[PDB]
Amino acid sequence: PLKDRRLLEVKLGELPSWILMRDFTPSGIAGAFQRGYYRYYNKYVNVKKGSVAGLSMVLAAYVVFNYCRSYKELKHERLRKYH
């Protein structure tokens, strides 16, 4: 009953239908990053008894980010050659 649905709702056959019904302009990129931040915020943070997990996630994410950034310079000391 709807053209645009949550990408999980849509099927594989109409997969490209979803890919083409949606927009791509940078404004529609900010209007996505914002939605992500605000889902996280209003679901795990803006609550009267926020916990560690309300924060630890972004930290342990930034961690993996800056690990991926560094992969190149770390292929030079693998303790074993044939992995």
Partner 1 sequence: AQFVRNLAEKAPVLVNAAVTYSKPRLATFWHYAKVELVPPTPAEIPTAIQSLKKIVNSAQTGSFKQLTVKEALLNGLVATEVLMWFYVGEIIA
Ligand X SMILES: CCCCCCCCCCCCCCCCCC(=O)OC[C@H](COP(=O)([O-])OCC(O)COP(=O)([O-])OC[C@@H](COC(=O)CCCCCCCCCCCCCCCCC)OC(=O)CCCCCCCCCCCCCCCCC)OC(=O)CCCCCCCCCCCCCCCCC
Alpha-carbon distance of 38 to 35, in angstroms, equals 5
Q: Report the residue number, 9 or 23, with the smaller CB distance to partner 1.
A: 9
Closest contact distance (angstroms) between CB of 33 and ligand X is 21
Residues that bind ligand X (CB under 6 A): 49-52, 55-56, 59
What are the residues binding partner 1 (CB under 8 A)? Answer: 7-13
Residues in the chain: 83
| Closest to ligand X by CB, 15 or 47 | 47
- Tokens 């529609």 -> residue: 28
Q: Give the residue carrying structure tokens 């310079």.
A: 73
